[PDB]
Amino acid sequence: TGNVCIEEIDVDGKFIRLKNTSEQDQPMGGWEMIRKIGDTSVSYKYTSRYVLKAGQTVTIWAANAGVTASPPTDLIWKNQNSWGTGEDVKVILKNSQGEEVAQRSTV
C-alpha cells in the first residue's frame, strides 16, 4: 500500500511535483491537478494514457520556466506561466472520479 503524493510546490512557482510512493503503477488518465491562487483555479488534465509508475515522480513545469519537456518525468503545462514567490498557492489532486485524493497548501 502506498499512494500518489503532492511532493512539492516550487517556492519560486515554476513547477509542481507528484510522487507515486506505492509499489503499484497508477494510470493518471482523467486525473485533474488544480492550481489555486486566490480566486483563480487552473486545471491540468493528465493525458488518457499517462501512467505514473511505482516510485516515480512527475513534475509539471510552467510553459515559461525555460525547461524542456522530458516525458514522462517532466511535463510542460501549456500556456500556464510561473506564479512567483510570496504567492499563497494551493494544489488539489482529483482522481479519475472527480473525487479528491490529495491536497497541499504552501504558506
C-alpha atoms as one frame of an Amber mdcrd trajectory, in Angstrom:
protein
   0.000   0.000   0.000   1.147   3.475  -0.963  -0.355   6.474  -2.740   0.150
   9.472  -5.019   1.580  12.403  -3.059   1.893  16.092  -3.941   5.596  16.129
  -3.110   6.406  19.784  -3.679   5.033  23.112  -4.842   8.026  25.130  -6.073
   8.660  28.122  -3.813   9.607  30.136  -6.911   6.407  28.886  -8.511   7.817
  27.267 -11.660   6.721  23.668 -11.082   4.627  21.239  -9.045   5.720  17.678
  -8.337   3.837  14.450  -7.683   5.089  11.087  -6.495   3.687   7.571  -6.535
   5.034   6.212  -3.243   3.140   2.971  -3.935   4.597  -0.259  -5.330   1.890
  -0.317  -7.978   1.800   1.823 -11.119  -1.049   4.326 -11.256  -2.697   5.452
 -14.522  -3.470   9.186 -14.465  -5.816   9.470 -17.418  -8.518  11.904 -16.415
  -6.888  12.860 -13.098  -7.036  16.618 -12.528  -4.367  18.789 -10.905  -5.892
  22.084  -9.763  -3.713  25.125  -9.031  -5.484  27.670  -6.850  -4.110  31.118
  -6.130  -6.620  33.447  -4.520  -9.769  33.497  -6.641  -8.443  31.697  -9.719
  -8.139  27.948 -10.268  -6.389  26.440 -13.290  -6.776  22.744 -14.099  -4.133
  20.451 -15.540  -5.579  17.237 -17.036  -3.264  14.242 -17.430  -3.410  12.529
 -20.840  -5.571   9.456 -21.335  -2.589   7.070 -21.323  -0.242   8.685 -18.810
   0.894   6.297 -16.066   2.864   7.372 -13.001   4.879   4.232 -12.320   5.586
   2.937  -8.825   8.113   5.157  -7.044   8.148   7.593  -9.960   7.684  11.360
  -9.848   6.216  13.670 -12.449   6.955  17.392 -12.462   4.711  19.881 -14.202
   6.627  22.971 -15.331   5.266  26.366 -16.297   5.466  26.976 -20.044   7.862
  29.858 -19.360  10.030  28.167 -16.718  12.521  27.572 -19.509  12.527  23.803
 -19.015  12.314  21.442 -21.963   9.734  18.621 -21.943  11.201  15.286 -20.832
   8.244  12.803 -20.721   7.195  11.105 -18.545   9.067  12.606 -15.587   8.847
  16.245 -16.666   5.939  17.846 -18.497   5.068  21.358 -19.588   1.795  22.981
 -18.543   0.857  24.510 -21.906   0.075  28.248 -21.652   0.362  28.491 -17.856
   3.181  30.687 -16.571   5.095  30.758 -13.277   3.402  32.401 -10.278   6.432
  33.830  -8.483   7.375  33.519  -4.814   5.387  35.003  -1.942   2.172  33.758
  -3.537  -0.088  31.652  -1.335  -0.751  28.644  -3.569  -2.938  25.579  -3.118
  -2.868  22.362  -5.135  -5.677  19.828  -5.262  -5.384  16.403  -6.864  -8.595
  14.744  -8.040  -8.704  11.164  -9.302 -10.445   9.812 -12.381 -13.736  10.107
 -10.478 -13.684  13.800  -9.661 -13.025  12.890  -6.032 -10.083  14.390  -4.137
  -7.143  12.175  -3.256  -4.647  14.784  -2.052  -4.177  18.449  -1.211  -1.253
  20.689  -0.350  -1.132  24.368   0.572   2.038  26.461   0.632   2.437  29.244
   3.207
